[PDB]
Amino acid sequence: AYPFDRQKFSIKVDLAVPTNMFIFNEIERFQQVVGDQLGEEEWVVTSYSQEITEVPFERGSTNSRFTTTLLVKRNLEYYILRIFVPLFLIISVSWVIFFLKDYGRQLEVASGNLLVFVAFNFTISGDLPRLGYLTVLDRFMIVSFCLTAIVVLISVCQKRLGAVGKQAVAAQIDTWVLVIYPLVYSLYIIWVYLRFFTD
């Protein structure tokens, strides 16, 4: 669910003697469990816990274990402002070109905006982890590229229609696209939320 994922950091300390010799009994708090440091941090801690349990031993019987768990999350303001806000403006440029009644200039603006989308992918290349599987952020960028590339295909069809002599048909396509295009993005976002977040 990158970048909206929450992880757990577990620090386990195990005794190396059987539980009939030494056993963990009490937990003392001689200092703050999570210290405070100046400045901001990449991972922020929301809660923590400490517990004592028993685990099987290689000798036999059991031994004691002391566990400290920290619940962490990322910095959401970083990804929203740096990635999602610029992405929205690039996408909205391809939506607004359908108001033009000429297609020799709509086609060249649509083709030019596809290059800006690809170039924008280089800046945020560092912010995209190089794992072997798709994440939530990776899926959204693939859908956006396909919709931007389809706009170029529709523009070519409209120009051919106008040159032949049928312009009313081309004008009706503009009305349908201006309505359907914002609808597909809204529907896809809801689908992503249902699949990965609300079970």
């Binding site: 440091q37 100046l38 400045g39 901001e40």
Partner: protein, 189 residues
């Protein structure tokens, strides 16, 4: 005896091992005479039993029934002179928040227990090279001023380590280091 706002302080006199030897008598005064071959005393002052400051003057003496300069009776800690010089800043890590430095460190102190006699060596200075203070102290079975870098990460490259002692008892330490120190107080906002 207190100066003002007397709280009736409690004082004790025990052995080096904590065994009591004498007790105060009510201006609290106490006396004690020891006859063993080795006799070491520890003076206890207790104030556990809200008060304003301390305002105290403690008087002690040996074979001085009068009391009320001479020579020191209490043990005194050694005084150490220290200096540090920085030669270079190798680098700064802005993700793990640590930096690397190159410099020189020097220590010096006076201890009569380290003295020797030139007759048994025909020399003026003793030498201990390429060994830390902790390692040398174990070899000669004498306490020495061991130190450490508080925020050190990993090992450090030490060069030109050496200790030299004079017959009087004056010793000194010299070392050139390359260390990496953790600095979690960095703020790049």
């Amino acid at each position: 005896e207190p100066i003002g706002e007397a709280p009736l302080p409690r004082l004790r006199l025990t052995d080096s091992g904590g065994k009591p030897l004498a007790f105060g008598l009510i201006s609290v005064e106490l006396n004690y005479t020891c006859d063993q071959d080795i006799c070491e005393l520890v003076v206890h002052v207790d104030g556990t039993d809200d008060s304003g400051e301390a305002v105290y003057r403690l008087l002690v003496g040996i074979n001085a029934p009068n009391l009320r300069v001479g020579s020191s009776v209490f043990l005194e800690s050694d005084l150490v002179t220290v200096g540090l010089a920085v030669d270079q800043i190798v680098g700064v890590d802005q993700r793990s928040e640590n930096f690397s430095v190159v410099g020189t460190l020097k220590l010096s102190w006076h201890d009569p227990k380290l003295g020797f006699s030139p007759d048994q060596c025909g020399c003026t200075v003793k030498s201990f090279e390429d060994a830390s203070i902790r390692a040398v102290a174990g070899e000669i079975n004498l306490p020495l001023p061991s130190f450490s870098f508080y925020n050190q990460q990993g090992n450090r490259w030490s060069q030109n380590q050496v200790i030299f002692v004079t017959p009087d008892g004056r010793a000194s330490y010299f070392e050139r280091f390359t260390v990496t120190l953790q600095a979690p107080d960095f703020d790049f906002l």
